Paper text:
Recently, the bacterial strain Ideonella sakaiensis 201-F6 was discovered and shown to grow on low-crystallinity PET films. Two α/β-hydrolase fold enzymes (α/β-hydrolases), PETase and MHETase, work together to degrade PET in two steps via MHET, yielding TPA and ethylene glycol—the building blocks required for a new round of PET synthesis. We have determined crystal structures of recombinantly expressed and purified I. sakaiensis MHETase in its ligand-free form (2.05 Å resolution), MHETase bound to a nonhydrolyzable mono-(2-hydroxyethyl) terephthalamide (MHETA, 2.1 Å resolution) or to benzoic acid (BA, 2.2 Å resolution) as well as ligand-free PETase (2.0 Å resolution) (2a−f). PETase and MHETase only share the α/β-hydrolase fold (2.87 Å RMSD for 184 out of 262 residues aligned).
The overall domain architecture of the 65 kDa MHETase resembles that of feruloyl esterases, with a lid domain inserted between β-strand 7 and α-helix 15 of the α/β-hydrolase fold. As previously observed for feruloyl esterases, the presence of a structural calcium-binding site was confirmed by X-ray fluorescence spectroscopy for MHETase. Likewise, one of five disulfide bonds is flanking a catalytic triad (formed by S225, H528, D492) and the oxyanion hole comprising the backbone amide nitrogen atoms of G132 and E226. In the ligand-free structure, F415 points away from the active site and thus opens it for substrate binding. While the α/β-hydrolase domain superimposes well with the closest structurally characterized feruloyl esterase homolog FaeB from A. oryzae (1.60 Å RMSD for 280 out of 342 residues aligned, 32.5% amino acid identity), the lid domain of MHETase contains several additional loops that markedly differ from FaeB (2.33 Å RMSD for 148 out of 215 residues aligned, 18.9% identity). The overall structures of MHETase and FaeB are structurally similar (2.04 Å RMSD for 421 out of 559 residues aligned) despite a relatively low number of amino acid identities (27.5%). When comparing MHETase with known tannase structures, e.g tannin acyl α/β-hydrolase from Lactobacillus plantarum (LptE), it is evident that only the overall fold of the α/β-hydrolase domain is similar (2.77 Å RMSD for 195 out of 282 residues aligned, 13.8% identity), while very large differences (5.24 Å RMSD) are observed for the lid domain. Contrasting consensus α/β-hydrolases, the bipartite architecture of MHETase parts catalysis from substrate recognition—a scenario where we envision the lid domain as a tunable platform to enhance catalytic properties (e.g. alleviating substrate release) or alter substrate specificity (as shown initially for the S416A, R411Q or F424N mutants reported here).
Author numbering: 43 to 56, 59 to 603
């Protein structure tokens, strides 16, 4: 009966603990000794670990579903509560020490937060249907779609805080959430749907319009097929064969030729992304290594993109339209992080989404036959479209941009909400959140090929338009060169939790956020640090000093 102790912990399993959801089943309530740090993780302090699940049930597809959660409460506690976000189609339960993304080694638990994670309402080892594209099969049960969209995050947040109050004898002082990609989508949902849940939110590469991802996939697949060479084993063009890595490298080298010095400093980084988009056209741009146009004047050479190739990538990058020309997603920024050479290793973190690996007799691009393609067909098209795995690439090739995009707005049968309803987080009404003191940091890599950074930018533009002074509670950090959540030739690592707490608890807004490069080899250097700047600002070299050193740069308007 002493608070914050072994006996208080073990007493949480079963009924002296009163859970807010009566269908909470604790499977584990265990005292854990402090654990040492490892090469990939910081030390963990002594704590009560609780895991279990909420709302065990049987879905209409005959499969079991439940909301799993795991929670960690340190014996020596700073008064703060933390939840980490998801990834992909979720379905797995992590260590739940409180990941802060950004390629960070530290966990929130290592900083004496109480921390929690969920699997989002389904389980990849159980919910795996061979007739419904394996692990996207949760899409066959309506309620599992709801838990994946919002309800699992909500159930798990309430369960955590109630255990925190019981264990420590007081409510948490402040609460925080960080997530990227599908995790970024959840933090944006929380600020909109559950504004008192978290005081501080970080949301990277946010899939805030995730049901549109597969529409862009069918589009980029069909856009690249004329440049393909040869067929796969089902008869479908080898989309991966449309550009060798050498070809994509010619592109990004041409983008650097047009765009790199527009920020004032030729450094392999397009800091002035707006000016870059205004200036770069592959059908006219020069290959800076030779005098000549990037696009072949006649026959194809190695220093030379064919007119078929140039036409294809321009169309992929423009974004999908229907027959009326209505934009269905957004366009994509040209940026050097479409390629990248570190040593002899070409950068795949852009390629892998629309093209897949050149060196293969099959298609393996995310948007052609991989997970995003399958996820669309079973999780976001309503009704679901299960099919054998070998028909997926053909189905993106036949995808009809007048018919099939409607299916992310439809309800049908017992699927009573559309995929945009339960998964979309497009709302700019953040007033409840700001007016209890909430603070939000958005980030996003410029050469992300899952979600367009420019579409996060348009979202932030709509937010500040609807809430004047938005920069007093919400700020957006674009990262030139970064791929999806990590990687690529840019400064893709950063501590997002320290500036967030300062903002929430002390009122210090972030005028910049320090960042560094996970792969400085992309520039041939041992390290690069750069200020991330609050949109619309960009990093600006002070005129003197090592270009790889943050302190020589300041956040400023574009020139
Ligand atoms: Ca530059
Ligand atoms: Zn455990
Ligand atoms: Zn040559």
């Amino acid at each position: 009966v002493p608070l914050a102790s072994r006996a208080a912990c073990e007493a949480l399993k079963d009924g002296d603990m009163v859970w807010p959801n009566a269908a909470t089943v604790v499977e584990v309530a265990a005292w854990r000794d402090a654990a040492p740090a490892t090469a990939s993780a910081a030390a963990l302090p002594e704590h009560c670990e609780v895991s279990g699940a909420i709302a065990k049930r049987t879905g209409i597809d005959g499969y079991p579903y439940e909301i799993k959660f795991r929670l960690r409460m340190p014996a020596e506690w700073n008064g703060r509560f933390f939840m980490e976000g998801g990834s992909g189609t979720n379905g797995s339960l992590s260590a739940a020490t409180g990941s802060i993304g950004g390629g960070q080694i530290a966990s929130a638990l290592s900083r004496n937060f109480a921390t929690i994670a969920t699997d989002g309402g389904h389980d990849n080892a159980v919910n795996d249907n061979p007739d419904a594209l394996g692990t996207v099969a949760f899409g066959l049960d309506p309620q599992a779609r709801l838990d994946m969209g919002y309800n699992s995050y909500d159930q798990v947040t309430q369960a955590g805080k109630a255990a925190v109050a019981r264990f420590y004898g007081r409510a948490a002082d402040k609460s925080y959430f960080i997530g990227c990609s599908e995790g970024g989508r959840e933090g944006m949902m929380l600020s909109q749907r559950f504004p008192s849940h978290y005081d501080g939110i970080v949301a990277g590469a946010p899939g805030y319009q995730l049901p549109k991802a597969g529409i862009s996939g069918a589009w980029t697949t069909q856009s690249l097929a004329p440049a393909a060479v040869g067929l796969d084993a089902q008869g479908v063009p080898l989309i991966n064969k449309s550009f060798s890595d050498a070809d994509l490298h010619l592109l990004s080298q041409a983008i650097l030729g047009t765009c790199d010095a527009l920020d004032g400093l030729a450094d392999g980084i397009v800091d002035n992304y707006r000016a870059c988009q205004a200036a770069f056209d592959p059908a006219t741009a020069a290959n800076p290594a030779n005098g000549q146009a990037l696009q072949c004047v006649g026959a194809k050479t190695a220093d030379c993109l064919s007119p078929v190739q140039v036409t294809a990538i321009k169309r992929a990058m423009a974004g999908p339209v229907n027959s009326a020309g209505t934009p269905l997603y957004n366009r994509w920024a040209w940026d050097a992080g479409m390629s990248g050479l570190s040593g002899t290793t070409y950068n795949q973190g852009w390629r892998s989404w629309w093209l897949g690996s050149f060196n293969s007799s099959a298609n393996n691009a995310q948007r052609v036959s991989g997970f995003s393609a399958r996820s669309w067909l079973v999780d976001f098209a309503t009704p679901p479209e299960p099919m054998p795995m070998t028909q997926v690439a053909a189905r993106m090739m036949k995808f009809d941009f007048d018919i099939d995009p409607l299916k992310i707005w439809a309800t049908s049968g017992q699927f009573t909400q559309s995929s945009m309803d339960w998964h979309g987080a497009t709302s700019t009404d953040l007033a409840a959140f700001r007016d209890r003191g909430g603070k939000m940091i958005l980030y996003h890599g410029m050469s992300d090929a899952a979600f367009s950074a420019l579409d996060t930018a348009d979202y932030y533009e709509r937010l500040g338009a609807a809430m004047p002074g938005a920069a007093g509670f919400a700020r957006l950090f674009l990262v030139p060169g970064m791929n999806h959540c990590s990687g690529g030739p840019g400064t893709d690592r950063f501590d997002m939790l320290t500036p967030l707490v300062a903002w929430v608890e002390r009122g210090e807004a972030p005028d910049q956020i320090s960042a560094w490069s996970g792969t400085p080899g992309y520039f041939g250097v041992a390290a690069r640090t750069r200020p991330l700047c609050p949109y619309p600002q960009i990093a600006r070299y002070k005129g003197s000093g090592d270009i790889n050193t943050e302190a020589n740069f300041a956040c400023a308007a574009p020139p």
